[PDB]
Amino acid sequence: KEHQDTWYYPPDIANDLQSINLPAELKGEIFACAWEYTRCVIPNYTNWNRYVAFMRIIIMGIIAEFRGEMVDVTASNNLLGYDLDATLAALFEGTPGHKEMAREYKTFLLITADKASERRDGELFRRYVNALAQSPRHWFRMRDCDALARFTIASALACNDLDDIWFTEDQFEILTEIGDTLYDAVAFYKHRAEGETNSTFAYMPEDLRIKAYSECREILWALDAAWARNPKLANVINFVRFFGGPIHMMMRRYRFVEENLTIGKSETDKVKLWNRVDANKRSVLNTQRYKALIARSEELMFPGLAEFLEMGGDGICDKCKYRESGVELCSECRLSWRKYLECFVERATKVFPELKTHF
Amino acid sequence: EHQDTWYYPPDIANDLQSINLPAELKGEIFACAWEYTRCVIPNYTNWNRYVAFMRIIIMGIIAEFRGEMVDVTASNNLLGYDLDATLAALFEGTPGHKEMAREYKTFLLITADKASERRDGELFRRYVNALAQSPRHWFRMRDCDALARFTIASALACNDLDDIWFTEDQFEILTEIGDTLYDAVAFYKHRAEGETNSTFAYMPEDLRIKAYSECREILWALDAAWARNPKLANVINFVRFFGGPIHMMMRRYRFVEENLTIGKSLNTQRYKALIARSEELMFPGLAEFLEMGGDGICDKCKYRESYGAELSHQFGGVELCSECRLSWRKYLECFVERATKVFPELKTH
Ligand SMILES: [Zn+2]
Ligand SMILES: [Zn+2]
């Protein structure tokens, strides 16, 4: 009686992973997911070879997240039978950010694969998690990377052949903050259940979730109005809008249907010993891995991440509870995070002046 | 708590000069036109068509707000807009200009009457009854009520895709997907509002979740099958973003107020006169639908005198019988079969 999903995807990717022995049902669902994500958050395309590149970037990141052993962006440049530099070139060759985005993506595969493997207990991840909680601006920069937000703004530009359009770093940070805030606001109860740490409103105060969503949505509406008559920038708004919650309704990866076409929770609704032993013998906290990766910070890490890990890896703050061998913010850090959120509107109006010259 | 500030292009900023409504209302209305248009037509190439579409929606919004203010019969000049002129700006040079004019005038016609004293009259009683004659008929009329093929039409227009069109049967399936997606998500809200135009007032509540899943699957199949044709992506995008997501995205809806949750809250003279204007006002077939269906074909089916007295926390149209409920059930159950006949590129994977 109850609908079983059949997986649809274009034949371009249907014979990918010919070298990987995953059940054929699971390949289909990975391919379906990659197609569904692409179409939801990049709904317009002109360049099909770029669209397909992006699909392959998502395929790898799904597999990276499900069996981290398989996807070691440090070890080789051939991942799951794909040429990673070549696939990224297929997407970004001619675009202003190619170099910085290839670094963005490799950081994503590093942290994702390490988070979904024995290397979760390793110095590198430990230092990533502590550096998350360093400041709210740091949190969002790193949240951006975990979600491939600025990476997907670029790929959206790219896939519509908009090879000349780009953004200040301040702008990228506001755009991704809007998307990540929208997404984490909608996904709050799902993140709490499954015990997800990379969630804005696990750090930011819960009492401001509804206002933050309201303001981020209003500002993106404002920003879209300001950019009216420039269909090219409509693709940057589209990424942020569809990413920011709607994909929960549209992609089979999410549970809209299994949860009776509801999102969220009303006010009146209900609320590895041996793996840790045998990992310590294999010296899981590999500092030589960490230092080796800090050495390759021009290849594997986004601009400033190496300096972020070195300064914040052990936690800057004295009263904050950090990860030792996520972060529980102290009350003075909770208040500064709160202050950073509460003045979101000013912060975005500074970086995007066009918001104040409406008519 | 959050007090909305309204954003919209300047182009329509000084629309409705002629009309005397408070500037905030006009701000909310322009906002909704802009937001609906960006949500369900998220790409454009031709700005002057985009803006016509926004004007098409502005008028539609007010028709629903105050029907008395938009009477598409009375005159072709509504709220200082020339309807035929806006429609021409949007659809001139495109396959369905003439058909989409009718589509829209029906929408204004029916929405005005729904939201006015004319809800007690003979046209609307015949409309409500006609809705429930047949499931095919239901989806065709619901299509018009939601401007589904109108907006598929508009989305091609706004992207200068003047050569692209679909058969009646493809429009019927395209809009059935979109309207089944939307009416499955909005079930409880439609029921609270005593709506007549809700798919699951008529189709069975225990197929609501499955029908959504099935429509979302086939739309993914159609999308995949349309791989490498980014013109047709504009069509998929309309059905996808219309079929639920607008509830999250538009300030028209109550996602923020509901704490970022979804689904967790006897005179004949006018009727006759408009049926004689069927070429201008009614979509191809609606006259026959209204004439054959207006009084009800079925006899175990429970109708009403007028649909005028305002209802709440219950659907406010024909209550189908044991036998009609089963033929409707069956029309739903073969949805996948019907969609595969109409778009054979589905089974040819
Ligand atoms: Zn602290
Ligand atoms: Zn009956």
B273-280 long-range Cβ contacts below 8 angstroms, 24+ apart: B274/B73, B274/B109, B274/B123, B277/B73, B279/B102, B280/B102, B280/B105
Whole-number Å distance between alpha carbons of A228 and A240: 16
- What are residue A328's DSSP bridge partners? A321
Pairs of residues, one from chain A and one from chain B, whose beta carbons lie less than 8 Å apart: 170
Whole-number Å distance between alpha carbons of B24 and B5: 9
A234/B44 CB distance under 8 A:
yes
Residue with tokens 């429609």: B87
Taking the CB of residue A255, how many other CB atoms lie within 10 A of it? 12
Whole-number Å distance between alpha carbons of B292 and B307: 19
Taking the CB of residue A115, how many other CB atoms lie within 10 A of it? 18
Whole-number Å distance between alpha carbons of B236 and A294: 45
Chain A segment 131-190 residues within 8 A of B by beta carbon are 185-186, 188
Whole-number Å distance between alpha carbons of A356 and A350: 9
In chain B, which residues are last before a break of more than 2.5 Å from C to the next N? 265
Residue of B nearest to A8 (CA): B221
Q: Which ligand is nearest to the CA of A318?
A: 1
Chain A segment 244-303 residues within 8 A of B by beta carbon are 245-246, 249-250, 252, 257, 260-267, 269
- What are residue A91's DSSP bridge partners? none
Tell me which DSSP letter residue B117 carries. G
Q: Which ligand is nearest to the CA of B325?
A: 2
Assigned token pair, B325: 């409920």
Assigned token pair, B117: 């004293």
Length of chain A: 359
Assigned token pair, A28: 């289909």
For A268, B182, B248, B260, B262, the CA distances from A186, given in Å and listed in that order, are: 18, 19, 9, 6, 10
Burial B311-321 (b: 16+ CB within 10 A, else e): beeebbbbebe
> Which secondary-structure segment (H or E) carries A109?
helix A98-115
Amino acid, res. A155: S
Amino acid, res. A164: D
Whole-number Å distance between alpha carbons of A294 and A211: 39
Residue of A nearest to B13 (CA): A359
Whole-number Å distance between alpha carbons of A85 and A93: 11
Assigned token pair, B30: 């322009």
Q: Which ligand is nearest to the CA of B320?
A: 2
DSSP string, A304-342: THHHHHHHHTT-S-SSSB------B--HHHHHHHHHHHH
Q: Does A48 touch chain B (CB under 8 A)?
A: yes
Ligand 1 centroid from CA A338, angstroms? 13
Report whether A350 contacts A219 (CB < 8 A).
Answer: no
Cβ neighbours of B47 in A, within 8 Å:
229
